Design a protein around this ligand. Sequence first.
Ligand SMILES: [Zn+2]
Ligand SMILES: [Zn+2]
Length: 161
Amino acid sequence: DFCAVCLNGGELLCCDRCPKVFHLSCHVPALTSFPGGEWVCTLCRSLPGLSMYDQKKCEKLVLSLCCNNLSLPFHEPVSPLARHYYQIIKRPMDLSTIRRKLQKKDPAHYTTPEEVVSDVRLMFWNCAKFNYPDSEVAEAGRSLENFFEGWLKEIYPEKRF
Ligand SMILES: [Zn+2]
Ligand SMILES: [Zn+2]
């Protein structure tokens, strides 16, 4: 009943192989039209810039982040009006920036999975550098990073990073 990424209702696409449902633009990659049917989400699929193999793996990683309820504070960039944020944080990073750079036409498209992982960790580092350690946001960032580091060993057991 609820999009797995933004937790809002409306016109939702169901994945056949898992309970998850998505707004078309909340899925990764975003869909621009509905499918006829028998559709499976990026998490349940099989198989310059990223190789097609790494593209799908990094899409699984980024969608796992977006679908986890702890990622909500990190879905969009911080408002540049936000007091002191852009003075402390010289390299802001957020999941809408990561999503966009996963698109192969993007002029800053990722070329290696290490680049994707470096941005994710940059996001967690900025969170802990700016937010009060007992803020709700800082707690969500620490807990989400533990999820991410676990998925990394699951999706790329071989790579060191
Ligand atoms: Zn959504
Ligand atoms: Zn699924």
